[PDB]
């Protein structure tokens, strides 16, 4: 039996599917099927401060050399005609209470992906909200104060977590994707899960950010590459700053980057240490998005039709059950 439900359990994965299924139960639509949510990878990693920032702040003892975090991979599956169809997947970076500033108590979405075959089509949007709001609610409960989202769609014919998408599933334009996350976060605010949210520029302004060493530094994020480019440009200068370039860049791309406050004011100051109840889950196939993208490209595990998607889901589960 190589079904999604059979995969090992986590406090995180069960919190999410319960939120999804309670929602669907209430909706009581006859075309909906049971959804199952599973964390298929959990490992401890570090994000190393890149050369420019290392020479400016690390070498002077002003900034930590690296930031420890936990990476988790999790996927969601719905029963569509007696069989599991993987319609959502996500990779996250979690920086706990032992992490040095500016990263402590922060979560970041590395990549998120979906296959538009959730049944019915009229309930897709609402189900995506349940998973994402549920993840925010879950980490807030553990004592993570902030969520970070880089709302950016893929490049020219680019695939994130799933191999070969339906040609019908259009790559959203940036303003559509931004509006989507704004709407999900307004809903999380109304449910009293998110205290408030802000764009990166407005957030640094309100935090009185004066140095590049104060900006959260995540694996594969836009801002560590911007700082590198900016330092290179500034070091090339001869005469016969960094923060002002950072503020200008942040203003220019502000709508793309969300800073989500889950815990506000004094409640965020007297928190106990973050204790994750879930154990580490070694699974090389799901350590980052590349290993599953390769296995799916080699074994032709496609998601370009409902039938092709259901097929590749089955294969995915057989591979996940082997380890």
Ligand X SMILES: CNC(=O)Nc1ccc2c(c1)CC[C@@]21OC(=O)N(CC(=O)N(Cc2ccc(F)cc2)[C@@H](C)C(F)(F)F)C1=O
The residue among 256, 73, 249, 75 whose CA lies nearest residue 153 is 256
Q: Is 160 in the site for ligand X (CB under 6 A)?
A: yes
CB 262 within 8 A of CB 148: no
Give the residue with the Cβ less far from ligand X, 79 or 159: 159
Site string for ligand X, 120-159 (x = CB under 6 A): --------x--xx--------------------xx----x
What's the Cα-to-Cα distance from 216 to each of 22, 108, 148, rounded to whole Å?
A: 35, 10, 9
Q: Binding segment for ligand X among 28-36, 136-144, 167-175, 214-222 (CB under 6 A)?
A: 167-175
Residue 76, Cα to own-chain centre: how many angstroms?
A: 14
One of 172, 283, 293, 306 touching ligand X (CB under 6 A): 172
176 is in an annotated binding site: yes
Least Å distance, CB 165 to ligand X, is 3
Tally helices (H) and strands (E) across the chain.
9, 7
167 binds ligand X (CB under 6 A): yes
Q: Which stretch binds ligand X (CB under 6 A): 34-42, 173-181, 236-244, 291-299?
A: 173-181
Q: Is 242 annotated as a binding residue?
A: no
Torsion sign over Cα 117, 158, 178, 39: positive
| H or E stretch at 150 | strand 146-150
The answer to whether the beta carbons of residues 39 and 74 sit under 8 Å apart is: yes
Name the residue nearer to ligand X (CB basis): 14 or 304.
304
**Which residues bind to Na ion, rule: CB under 5 A?**
111-112
Rounded to the nearest whole angstrom, what is the least distance from the CB of residue 111 to Na ion in the complex?
A: 4
124 is in an annotated binding site: yes
Breaks (C-N over 2.5 A) in the chain follow: 240
Cβ count within 10 A of residue 51:
12
Three-state DSSP class for 45? strand
- Interface with ligand X by CB under 6 A: which range of 16-24, 38-46, 112-120, 248-256? 112-120
Q: Residue 285, interface with ligand X (CB under 6 A)?
A: no
Residue given tokens 């500034």 in the structure block: 234
Residue 48: strand pairing partners: 66
Least distance between ligand X and beta carbon 68 (Å): 27
Given the structure tokens 């599991």, which residue do they identify? 84
Was 294 annotated as part of a binding site?
A: no
Nearer to ligand X among residue 131 and residue 200 (C-beta): 131
Does 113 bind ligand X (CB under 6 A)? Our answer is yes
Among ligand X, Na ion, none, residue 223 binds (CB under 5-8 Å by kind): none
* Sites of contact with ligand X (CB under 6 A): 88, 112-114, 128, 131-132, 153-154, 159-160, 165, 167, 169, 171-172, 176-177, 180
């Amino acid at each position: 039996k190589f079904s999604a439900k059979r995969l090992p359990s986590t406090r995180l994965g069960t919190f999410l599917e319960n939120r999804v299924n309670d929602f669907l139960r209430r909706q009581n639509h006859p075309e909906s099927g049971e959804v199952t949510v599973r964390v298929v990878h959990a490992s401890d990693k570090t994000v190393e401060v890149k050369p420019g920032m290392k020479a400016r702040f690390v070498d002077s003892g002003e900034m930590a050399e690296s930031f420890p975090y936990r990476t988790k991979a999790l996927f969601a599956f719905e029963e569509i005609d007696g069989v599991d169809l993987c319609f959502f997947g996500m990779h996250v970076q979690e920086y706990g209470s032992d992490c040095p500033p500016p990263n402590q108590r922060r979560v970041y979405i590395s990549y998120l992906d979906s296959v538009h075959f959730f049944r019915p089509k009229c309930l897709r949007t609402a189900v995506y909200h349940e998973i994402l709001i549920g993840y925010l609610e879950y980490v807030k409960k553990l004592g993570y104060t902030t969520g970070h989202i880089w709302a950016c769609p893929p490049s020219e014919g680019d695939d994130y977590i799933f191999h070969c998408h339906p040609p019908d599933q259009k790559i959203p334009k940036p303003k559509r994707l931004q509006e989507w996350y704004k709407k999900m976060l307004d809903k999380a605010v109304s449910e009293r899960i998110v205290h408030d949210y802000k764009d990166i520029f407005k957030q640094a302004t309100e935090d009185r950010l004066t140095s590049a060493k104060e900006l959260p530094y995540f694996e594969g994020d836009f801002w560590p590459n911007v700082l590198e480019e900016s330092i290179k440009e500034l070091e090339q200068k001869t005469s016969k700053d960094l923060s002002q370039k950072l503020y200008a860049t942040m203003e220019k791309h502000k709508e793309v980057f969300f800073v989500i406050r889950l815990i506000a004011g004094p409640a965020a100051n007297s928190l106990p240490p973050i204790v994750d109840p879930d154990p580490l889950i070694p699974c090389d196939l799901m350590d980052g998005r590349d290993a599953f993208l390769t296995l799916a490209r080699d074994r032709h595990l496609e998601f370009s039709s409902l039938r092709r998607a259901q097929w590749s889901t089955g294969c995915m589960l057989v591979e996940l059950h082997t380890q």
